Amino acid sequence: ALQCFCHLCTKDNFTCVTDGLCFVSVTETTDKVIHNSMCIAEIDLIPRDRPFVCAPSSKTGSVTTTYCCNQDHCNKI
Amino acid sequence: VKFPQLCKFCDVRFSTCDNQKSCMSNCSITSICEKPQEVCVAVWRKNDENITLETVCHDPKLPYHDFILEDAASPKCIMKEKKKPGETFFMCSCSSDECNDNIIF
Amino acid sequence: ALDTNYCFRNLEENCCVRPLYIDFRQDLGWKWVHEPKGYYANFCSGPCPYLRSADTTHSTVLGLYNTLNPEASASPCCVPQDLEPLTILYYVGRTPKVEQLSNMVVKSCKCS
Amino acid sequence: ALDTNYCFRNLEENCCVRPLYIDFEQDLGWKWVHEPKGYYANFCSGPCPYLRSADTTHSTVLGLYNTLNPEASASPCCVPQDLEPLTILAYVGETPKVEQLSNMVVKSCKCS
Amino acid sequence: CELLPVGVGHPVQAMLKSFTALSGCASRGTTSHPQEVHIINLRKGSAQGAREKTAEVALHLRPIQSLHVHQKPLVFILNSPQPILWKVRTEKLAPGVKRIFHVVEGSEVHFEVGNFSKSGEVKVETLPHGNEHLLNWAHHRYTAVTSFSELRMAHDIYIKVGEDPVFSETCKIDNKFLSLNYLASYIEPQPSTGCVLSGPDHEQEVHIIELQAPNSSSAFQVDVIVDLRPLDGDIPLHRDVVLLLKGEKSVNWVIKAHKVMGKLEIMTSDTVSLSEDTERLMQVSKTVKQKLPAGSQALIQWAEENGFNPVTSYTNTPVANHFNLRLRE
């Protein structure tokens, strides 16, 4: 399946295999930045036409860039 | 991956909005455009004493009822002075979430 | 267990199900759900004392440990055990679709 | 995955596996297990932000609600996912027993 | 479903695995002595099927819980009533540590890690059968014993080299002495009862395995290991399988399916931890914790009411903590 970076997987060295999408979210806090790169499977994509998890999630107060890409090892921006 | 947009899918309907700077579509159904390239467009015809509103996703690079949107990338819907023979034809193009649901004249 | 009937009938101070109503729009921000427009998600809260519907051996051990040393803060927490599906309706263009989001309704809770 | 490898080498605050060594007889009143005198149990601790290993749709929905409902006091609690067994040298009358004790050490803590 | 003893042809085989040592001792007094001494007094097993072939017995080493790496010389006096081939599966052991293997005539040393073979040795010596005489031999050439052990016929031997300070400064043989740092793991057959309803399906298979006792004398949760493999050969198989596991007590099932591909569904009343190897090869569904009914017929009709029919076979095992299942091609 697809090849995405899992910023929390060490055994496979930051490489998670998914049949859904690569998920990269950058959170901008007042003193730190957190990048949650993870694999999202097909059944977790609901609705498939426009999943809410991968749907845009830009809220007020926090400059969060939710971002799902489709290529292999693309979830890095 | 750019995903579809959130436009109302109301088709043929009857509304009582006119002579207003802005008004709401009164539609009850916010829908996900079936294809990522579609945009929200609302058509407003005022025939005699009958006013009909129809609002659905539109494929900008294609004519719906033989017309072209000049501002298909706009975020908010603005009704422009469309011309038809003896028909107060109006159409707006917006490219945000549920933007066709709010209508500004 | 700490099921719906028990937790919503008799007031308890330990882990249990607490009332919760979530509307897809005013709180979650979802703008694309047709019917229903709300549901009782429910959730589990309430501290876990020792010997309260043990989850696993590690939870039992931590409960006893805290009983003998509550100051450690290494105790089982309030965690859902059973979940049930939810059915919604969504409009894909002019052709509406009804889909069921599984594991949405919690029926009970356990200490872990 | 949130396990010992990443949690221990990083000063993580969220859900993860944290160190825990428990002396059986001293800290549990367990004289029935003669060896080991103690073992590393580990435990699950930390808050759960949005999209941190949430197992189910219910967990994600509760996390989203808490994110948009800061004071709702309904967020997922850190819980152990997979545990490994521990080997014990039990004493039954006069005969020592070597029994493989299960769910004794936590190696994966999730937000559920 | 006629309840009959489980034979060789049954698709489910149950085993019981335990760690036992006939006798032994230990001592921390070898701190002053230059080398540690460890003795494995093997004994002929109760099985009468060993006539011609010489059994191969392995060895597993680990630094004790208080040590990360063990480097002190490790002398293994391996008395063997019959010829045996010896494998040395080390772990966390520094190179260059001499491993002298005083073995009887006809016995040798074999390395799965041959690096220590340059320092390993194979000595042929006459050693007494008795443990007491055998211990006397060690002091007459080494002056102390770091640890002593007596074990019966087996195939593996777990040793955690290291001097535990809890033990004594002197060694005395006691049949009731046992410790984690020196153990021998054994496996024994476990008879079971059940019935076979349908033959081996090429698309979907369902077998019932009922466990009563995990062979635990304690009052906590233990592990039961499910082993799934092809009937014969090393050829991977593609199949769908649903397993109905019933445990009377609190157990933590462990799934180890080797050389299997496809889909797997496990429905059981007790928590399950899946082996890493089995997870990758097969799409094992996440089990739902459902209180199953009681009785063979109830479970059969229960599943038949959930669409998982026909059920391949039914099994019932009173006592075990290790289950095996073989898939027919």
Author numbering:
A (entry chain C): 31 to 107
B (entry chain D): 45 to 149
C (entry chain A), D (entry chain B): 301 to 412
E (entry chain E): 31 to 359
The authors write:
Betaglycan (BG) is a transmembrane co-receptor of the transforming growth factor-β (TGF-β) family of signaling ligands. It functions by enabling binding of the three TGF-β isoforms to their signaling receptors and is additionally required for inhibin A (InhA) activity. BG is nonetheless essential in vivo, where it binds and potentiates the activity of the three TGF-β isoforms (TGF-β1, -β2 and -β3) by presenting them to their signaling receptors, TGF-β receptor type I (TGFBR1) and TGF-β receptor type II (TGFBR2)4. BG, and a homologous co-receptor of the TGF-β family known as endoglin (ENG) which potentiates the function of BMP9 and BMP10, are transmembrane proteins with a large (approximately 760 amino acids) extracellular region comprised of two domains: the membrane-distal orphan domain and the juxtamembrane zona pellucida (ZP) domain19,20.
Additionally, in a separate approach we wanted to obtain the structure of the TGF-β:BGO complex bound to both of the signaling receptors, TGFBR1 and TGFBR2. As the TGF-β1:(TGFBR2):(TGFBR1)2 heterotetrameric assembly cannot recruit BGO, we aimed to construct a variant with the signaling receptors bound to only one monomer of TGF-β. We therefore switched to the TGF-β3 heterodimer, TGF-β3WD, a mutated form that indeed can bind only one pair of TGFBR2:TGFBR1. We successfully assembled the TGFβ3WD:zfBGO:TGFBR2:TGFBR1 complex and in this case we used the more flexible TGF-β3, expecting that the bound TGFBR1, which spans the TGF-β dimer interface, would lock TGF-β3 in the closed conformation. Cryo-EM analysis of both complexes yielded density that closely accommodated the component structures and enabled domain placement without ambiguity. Despite this, it was difficult to build molecular models due to strong preferential alignment of the particles.
